[PDB]
Structure 1
Amino acid sequence: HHWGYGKHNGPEHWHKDFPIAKGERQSPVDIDTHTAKYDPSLKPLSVSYDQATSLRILNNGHAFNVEFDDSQDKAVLKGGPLDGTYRLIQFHFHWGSLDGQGSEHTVDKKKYAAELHLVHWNTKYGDFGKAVQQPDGLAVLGIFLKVGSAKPGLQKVVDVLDSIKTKGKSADFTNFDPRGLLPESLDYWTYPGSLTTPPLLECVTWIVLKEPISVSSEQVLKFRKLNFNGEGEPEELMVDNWRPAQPLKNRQIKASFK
């Protein structure tokens, strides 16, 4: 019926409705650190989020998105392996039912507790919808979360979750600064890939940060309290909303560092 992460509609069944699931440039992948090639020609990433305008938070039934105003060049990503400017449209997470799983990308087969995705679209395409039809339409920054110390900058997000518990709920969410979610180092890995949920379009340049951020157990615990279901439907906790690693095929992972 419609896709999800359960036994009957989970990642292993997505190919029936979205044949691109068995495509040549699917994500996520396992990052083999000894095989990634250092590329001295990659430029440092440039993150300009000081003018970011958040608008809302929404439970879409598969995760929660914080949405931003992308009508102008307010929060952009450039440099790194990118050509042109990419505007932030939304961020969301993928997490597990336990601390030993949750990330989409793995590092030398290591799974993290969760993974943050900051989604950006190439301004040359004019809107998000046109950008998803192009091989270079999106740029996603992926950041791993491990459990340790609490992340101060994440608390405002944790605290509104109660108000968007079930599918379709939303809440005003203004003045959130996504700079509070970045690790200290911007060193990264990059490879060409796809969105990790249907429609699984291969339009993404992934930028995966080497340094994870830490969150406390209590913070991640609040994520696991969300629901996949709509209000008044039987309760299915929103956990394990991650897709397993896909074959690398004909692709090379490049590193911005050694």
Structure 2
Amino acid sequence: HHWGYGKHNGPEHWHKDFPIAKGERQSPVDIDTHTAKYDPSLKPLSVSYDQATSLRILNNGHAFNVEFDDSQDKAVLKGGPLDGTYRLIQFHFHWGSLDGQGSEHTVDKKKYAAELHLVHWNTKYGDFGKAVQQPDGLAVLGIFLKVGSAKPGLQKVVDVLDSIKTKGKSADFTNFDPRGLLPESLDYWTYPGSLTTPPLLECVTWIVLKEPISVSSEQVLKFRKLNFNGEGEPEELMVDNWRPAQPLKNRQIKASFK
């Protein structure tokens, strides 16, 4: 009886196996745009993805991860609220069963159709497993998806999903350029938080972009054809794999923009 997104194992149950679920810096949160404070000391984000080396795409039973070679400084995030250099290890999405839900963060209570997380770890800790044990171990760049025009840079991801329909399936996925998933503006909100899936560790500097990307209805429909289950098990569509907003508690959200 392991965690998931169903009626009997979903987010409201996670605290029994992962008591940090009720912790002091849990994610996601609602971003109240009027209460977020502009911080003029925040620097522009530096996204350096030109040498990124994607390797594989994996259905892990909760989402699909596009994985990267993180054994060198090839795709890195720095600047913004961050001290030091953070290496891209994977990206994945959270999405809904309907266009009116799917994101984890919300903006003035608005839910987007999906949310992309680009996960990076602080190179001063040597590897991802050590980084997640540190309060400044990870930096996650969160990008909202709305349904409208297609995102051409997403299509290569969409077209491979048929090969990883069920839990545990992976496929070679080389030469994917994550720059094709970024919006025009890098204006952002930032706050200290957590992983949004178990183990829910409180190790993330969240950087959430204000500008959403647009994807087509056909693109998001293909996300919704994935399966939570493994091959040969009863089919349960991979939809609504999002954790709802958690209490802000003693945190301030900062904005890079006026």
TM-score (norm 1): 1.00
- Identity of counterpart residues, as a percentage? 100
User: In structure 1, what is the Cα distance between the partners aligned to 2:234 and 2:106?
Assistant: 32
- 1:128-154 per-position Cα deviation (integer Å, ceiling 9, x unaligned): 000000000000000000000000000
Q: Who is 1:191 aligned against?
A: 191
User: In structure 2, what is the Cα distance between the partners aligned to 1:201 and 1:246?
Assistant: 14
- 1:71-124 per-position Cα deviation (integer Å, ceiling 9, x unaligned): 000000000000000000000000000000000000000000000000000000
User: In structure 2, what is the Cα distance between the partners aligned to 1:165 and 1:205?
Assistant: 31
CA displacement at 1:42 relative to structure 2: 0.3
- 1:132-182 per-position Cα deviation (integer Å, ceiling 9, x unaligned): 000000000000000000000000000000000000000000000000000
User: In structure 2, what is the Cα distance between the partners aligned to 1:23 and 1:215?
Assistant: 34
Structure 1 runs of 4+ off > 2 angstroms?
none
Structure 1 unmatched ranges of 5 or more: none
TM-score (norm 2): 1.00
2:107 equivalent to 1:81: no
User: In structure 1, what is the Cα distance between the partners aligned to 2:94 and 2:243?
Assistant: 9
CA displacement at 1:28 relative to structure 2: 0.2
Matches within 5 A, 1:90-239: 90-239=90-239
User: In structure 1, what is the Cα distance between the partners aligned to 2:2 and 2:47?
Assistant: 36
Secondary structure in 2 matching 1:246: coil
User: In structure 2, what is the Cα distance between the partners aligned to 1:10 and 1:43?
Assistant: 37
Alignment size in residue pairs: 258
Matches within 5 A, 1:28-67: 28-67=28-67
* RMSD, aligned CA: 0.2
User: In structure 1, what is the Cα distance between the partners aligned to 2:110 and 2:8?
Assistant: 27
User: In structure 1, what is the Cα distance between the partners aligned to 2:37 and 2:24?
Assistant: 20
Structure 2 unmatched ranges of 5 or more: none
